[PDB]
Amino acid sequence: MSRSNRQKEYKCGDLVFAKMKGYPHWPARIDEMPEAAVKSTANKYQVFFFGTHETAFLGPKDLFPYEESKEKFGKPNKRKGFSEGLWEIENNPTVKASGY
């Protein structure tokens, strides 16, 4: 009916700030590496970027929680893809689950 928040440890369905090489910490969701379309590898995690709306192979080193993010900054450069991006996650287009 709607994504479920984690307990004590982050897991699939967990939304955090994922940054990429040349790209500032963007709002990306956590995802596990599937093995259907292709054969994933080890020591790697699936990350889904909202702003860009694309997936990228990242890990925990490329993902930071709000607690930590807010600890230092938690607020990356405010770009065009940042506004619509952060809103792309907070205000997805294909909504359905109660949320604002």
Q: Please tell me whether 80 is known to bind a ligand.
A: yes
Closest CA to 18 of 10, 31, 27, 9: 27
Cα angle: 52, vertex 54, 59; to 5 degrees: 105
Radius of gyration of the chain (CA): 14
User: 81 with 24: CB under 8 angstroms?
Assistant: no
Is residue 19 marked as binding?
A: yes
Known binding positions for heparin: 19, 21, 72, 75, 79-80
Annotated binding site: 19, 21, 72, 75, 79-80
